[PDB]
Copies of this chain bind each other. A is one copy, B any other.
Amino acid sequence: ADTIVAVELDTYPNTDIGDPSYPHIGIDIKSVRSKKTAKWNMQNGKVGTAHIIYNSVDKRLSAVVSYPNADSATVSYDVDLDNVLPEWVRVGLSASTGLYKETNTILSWSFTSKLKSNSTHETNALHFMFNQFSKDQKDLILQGDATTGTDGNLELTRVSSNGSPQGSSVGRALFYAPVHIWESSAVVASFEATFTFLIKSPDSHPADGIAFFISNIDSSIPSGSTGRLLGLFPDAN
């Protein structure tokens, strides 16, 4: 199977696979069963912002999610990504719905990776920023139900013309260029990602959520990864 590291914004509590009894943010290392979670006071229909940070010196993956006029949620996990991920990866966003549903709308997405070697003035870097998505966005790989250009947004899961989110949907966007997160001369490797999102549901129980993920470069949506598996995992192990 693929190798996945993800930060989940998990809108539906699946307590049978170890979710807490509430919407939560989590850090997923090769499993949907988050290694660490925090309570998330998700706001139906409001624009939120998520920040993800990591560096190879501290080996700590951290994330913060907030809405305007509200307190943040934060989660951290100690993990050496050089022991989990290959040296070249792709980065992306994933989302799903199941019998319960929501919009999984991405309004902006930025990413920076840096690899600093012991050579004098020797940083390698990649940065991208999308504030508007176009109908034919050639620097994104869209998978499953993901589409771009409707109001300049990335719709990770299926939405009707009238704007109703559909059930049993899964979709992903990956940046086209591979990202280098380890090199033998590297003294520090870091990355940061930010995305803004709008999760709206006509229902009291939205599902299933959005994730930022890092994967092997050839990652594809696993078979049957609608609903609680967030487009990331083939099963709940």
What is the interface of chain A, defined by CB distance below 8 A to chain B?
Answer: 47, 49, 51, 53, 55, 57-58, 60, 62, 64, 66-70, 72, 74, 76, 88, 108, 116-132, 134, 138-139, 152, 175-180, 183, 185, 187-188, 190, 194, 196, 217
Contact = CB atoms under 8 A, between A and B. Distances in A.
24 contacts: A49-B118, A51-B187, A58-B58, A58-B62, A60-B60, A68-B119, A70-B118, A72-B118, A108-B121, A117-B132, A119-B152, A123-B129, A123-B131, A125-B129, A127-B128, A128-B177, A134-B180, A138-B180, A139-B177, A139-B178, A139-B179, A176-B177, A176-B178, A177-B177
A138 to B, nearest CB: 4
Given A126-B139, A176-B177, A196 B62 contact: no
B62 A76 contact: no
B49 A120 contact: yes
Contacts of A60: 58, 60
Nearest to A57: B62
A107 to B, nearest CB: 8
Contacts of A125: 127-129
A62 B187 CA distance: 12
A66 B64 CA distance: 32
Contacts of A74: 57
Contacts of A176: 176-178
